[PDB]
Amino acid sequence: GSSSKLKPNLGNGADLPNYRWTQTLSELDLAVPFCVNFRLKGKDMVVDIQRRHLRVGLKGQPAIIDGELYNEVKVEESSWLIADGAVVTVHLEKINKMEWWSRLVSSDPEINTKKINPEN
Known part of the structure:
Protein backbone atom coordinates (compact mmCIF):
# COMPACT_ATOMS: atom_id res chain seq x y z
CA GLY A 1 0.00 0.00 0.00
CA SER A 2 0.84 3.71 0.13
CA SER A 3 2.39 5.51 3.11
CA SER A 4 3.10 9.08 4.29
CA LYS A 5 4.51 11.43 1.63
CA LEU A 6 7.10 14.22 1.43
CA LYS A 7 6.77 17.64 -0.21
CA PRO A 8 8.81 17.80 -3.45
CA ASN A 9 11.89 20.04 -3.55
CA LEU A 10 12.15 22.79 -6.18
CA GLY A 11 13.78 20.38 -8.61
CA ASN A 12 10.73 18.09 -8.41
CA GLY A 13 12.60 15.43 -6.46
CA ALA A 14 13.06 14.64 -2.78
CA ASP A 15 15.25 15.84 0.05
CA LEU A 16 16.17 12.84 2.24
CA PRO A 17 18.41 12.94 5.29
CA ASN A 18 21.35 11.29 3.48
CA TYR A 19 20.88 12.48 -0.12
CA ARG A 20 18.72 14.57 -2.40
CA TRP A 21 17.67 14.28 -6.01
CA THR A 22 15.92 16.29 -8.67
CA GLN A 23 14.31 15.16 -11.95
CA THR A 24 12.77 16.11 -15.24
CA LEU A 25 10.42 13.86 -17.20
CA SER A 26 13.41 12.08 -18.75
CA GLU A 27 16.19 12.01 -16.15
CA LEU A 28 17.14 12.18 -12.47
CA ASP A 29 20.18 13.72 -10.75
CA LEU A 30 21.24 12.58 -7.28
CA ALA A 31 23.68 14.07 -4.76
CA VAL A 32 25.05 11.99 -1.88
CA PRO A 33 27.38 13.84 0.51
CA PHE A 34 29.91 11.88 2.54
CA CYS A 35 31.29 13.18 5.83
CA VAL A 36 34.61 11.40 6.19
CA ASN A 37 38.05 12.16 7.63
CA PHE A 38 39.95 11.11 4.52
CA ARG A 39 40.04 12.01 0.82
CA LEU A 40 37.21 10.20 -0.96
CA LYS A 41 38.50 8.05 -3.83
CA GLY A 42 36.86 5.57 -6.19
CA LYS A 43 38.62 2.73 -4.40
CA ASP A 44 36.66 3.61 -1.24
CA MET A 45 33.28 3.58 -3.03
CA VAL A 46 31.00 0.82 -4.23
CA VAL A 47 28.51 2.24 -6.71
CA ASP A 48 26.42 0.01 -8.92
CA ILE A 49 23.88 1.43 -11.34
CA GLN A 50 21.63 -1.33 -12.65
CA ARG A 51 18.63 -1.26 -15.02
CA ARG A 52 16.33 -1.20 -12.00
CA HIS A 53 18.55 -1.12 -8.94
CA LEU A 54 20.94 1.35 -7.34
CA ARG A 55 23.67 0.85 -4.77
CA VAL A 56 25.76 3.73 -3.35
CA GLY A 57 28.03 3.57 -0.33
CA LEU A 58 31.46 3.25 1.25
CA LYS A 59 33.33 -0.07 1.31
CA GLY A 60 32.86 -1.89 4.60
CA GLN A 61 29.98 0.36 5.58
CA PRO A 62 26.20 0.02 5.33
CA ALA A 63 25.19 1.32 1.91
CA ILE A 64 23.52 4.72 1.87
CA ILE A 65 21.35 3.53 -1.04
CA ASP A 66 20.68 -0.11 -1.89
CA GLY A 67 17.27 -0.54 -3.44
CA GLU A 68 14.94 -1.10 -6.37
CA LEU A 69 14.65 1.96 -8.62
CA TYR A 70 11.18 3.47 -9.17
CA ASN A 71 11.40 2.48 -12.84
CA GLU A 72 13.97 1.34 -15.42
CA VAL A 73 16.99 3.37 -16.45
CA LYS A 74 19.34 3.22 -19.43
CA VAL A 75 22.61 2.12 -17.79
CA GLU A 76 24.61 3.06 -20.90
CA GLU A 77 23.50 6.69 -20.54
CA SER A 78 23.68 6.80 -16.74
CA SER A 79 26.78 7.73 -14.74
CA TRP A 80 28.34 8.79 -11.49
CA LEU A 81 31.29 10.71 -10.16
CA ILE A 82 32.92 11.97 -7.02
CA ALA A 83 32.38 15.74 -7.13
CA ASP A 84 34.37 18.26 -5.08
CA GLY A 85 33.88 18.30 -1.31
CA ALA A 86 33.11 14.56 -1.14
CA VAL A 87 29.72 14.69 -2.85
CA VAL A 88 28.92 11.64 -4.94
CA THR A 89 26.67 12.53 -7.86
CA VAL A 90 24.64 10.13 -10.00
CA HIS A 91 22.92 10.87 -13.29
CA LEU A 92 20.18 8.49 -14.37
CA GLU A 93 18.60 8.45 -17.81
CA LYS A 94 15.04 7.08 -17.69
CA ILE A 95 13.77 4.43 -20.13
CA SER A 106 11.07 1.85 -3.27
CA SER A 107 12.15 1.96 0.37
CA ASP A 108 11.90 5.81 0.44
CA PRO A 109 8.67 7.67 1.22
CA GLU A 110 7.10 9.03 -1.98
CA ILE A 111 6.98 12.69 -2.77
CA ASN A 112 3.50 14.11 -3.23
CA THR A 113 3.51 14.32 -7.03
CA LYS A 114 0.43 16.58 -6.98
CA LYS A 115 2.88 19.30 -5.95
CA ILE A 116 5.28 18.78 -8.85
CA ASN A 117 5.76 21.93 -10.91
CA PRO A 118 6.83 21.02 -14.47
CA GLU A 119 8.33 24.48 -15.11
CA ASN A 120 10.40 23.90 -11.94
Missing part, protein backbone atom coordinates in the same frame (compact mmCIF):
# COMPACT_ATOMS: atom_id res chain seq x y z
CA ASN A 96 10.25 5.87 -20.04
CA LYS A 97 11.16 9.53 -20.61
CA MET A 98 7.71 10.96 -19.94
CA GLU A 99 7.15 9.92 -16.33
CA TRP A 100 7.54 11.71 -12.99
CA TRP A 101 9.12 9.44 -10.39
CA SER A 102 7.69 9.62 -6.86
CA ARG A 103 10.86 8.24 -5.27
CA LEU A 104 14.40 7.16 -6.12
CA VAL A 105 14.15 3.73 -4.49
